[PDB]
Amino acid sequence: WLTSIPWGKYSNENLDLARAQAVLEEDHYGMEDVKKRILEFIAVSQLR
Amino acid sequence: VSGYVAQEKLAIAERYLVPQARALCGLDESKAKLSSDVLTLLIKQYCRESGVRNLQKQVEKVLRKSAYKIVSGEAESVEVTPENLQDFVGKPVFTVE
């Protein structure tokens, strides 16, 4: 159980905003507020 | 320990608070100016609590929203101004003491 835990495995993200635009719009109409927040999140992580 | 005078919170936040959140949002002063007057308007209006925690949330919100305007947006240097402010953090909440 101790050895099983990952220590540093870091799934790589997509980081292009465009592809995030699409995939957010593909599957949920509206609810624009949450879309704006999460998009802002990726936009900042790409920076810092 | 006591509460804090409105100006007292000003003297706090310009030194020991804004730079801290600025290091949390990862920005530098070159692109994310915050005049004193915006802070005085903020603390006078949007948060009336003796503790400083609520002002800490506001100033956080403002900074990271500025970051979103940088990383993809237009301006290379956001400049908060009191007329600008209503954009970033919205409409005044409290007024009628």
Side-chain angles (χ1 to χ4, degrees), chain A residues 1-34:
Chain A
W1 260 104
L2 195 147
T3 51
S4 294
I5 307 161
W7 301 274
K9 291 279 174 283
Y10 273 8
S11 304
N12 178 12
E13 296 66 350
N14 68 305
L15 308 170
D16 59 347
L17 290 153
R19 185 257 173 168
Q21 297 297 102
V23 70
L24 279 295
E25 291 308 331
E26 285 205 349
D27 311 335
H28 289 81
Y29 171 98
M31 293 182 286
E32 188 277 332
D33 199 333
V34 186

Side-chain angles (χ1 to χ4, degrees), chain B residues 13-64:
Chain B
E14 289 188 29
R15 302 201 278 118
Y16 298 0
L17 206 54
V18 169
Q20 172 48 19
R22 208 188 269 281
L24 268 294
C25 282
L27 192 45
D28 183 355
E29 295 283 330
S30 163
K31 311 164 280 276
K33 281 311 310 304
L34 287 179
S35 77
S36 71
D37 72 354
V38 166
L39 285 151
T40 311
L41 276 186
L42 192 158
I43 61 174
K44 198 167 64 55
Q45 284 190 305
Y46 299 172
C47 302
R48 59 188 66 269
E49 167 175 23
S50 63
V52 184
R53 190 182 289 285
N54 267 16
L55 158 63
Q56 204 288 336
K57 295 287 170 46
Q58 304 300 3
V59 66
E60 174 46 27
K61 172 184 290 194
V62 168
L63 282 184
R64 95 193 160 197

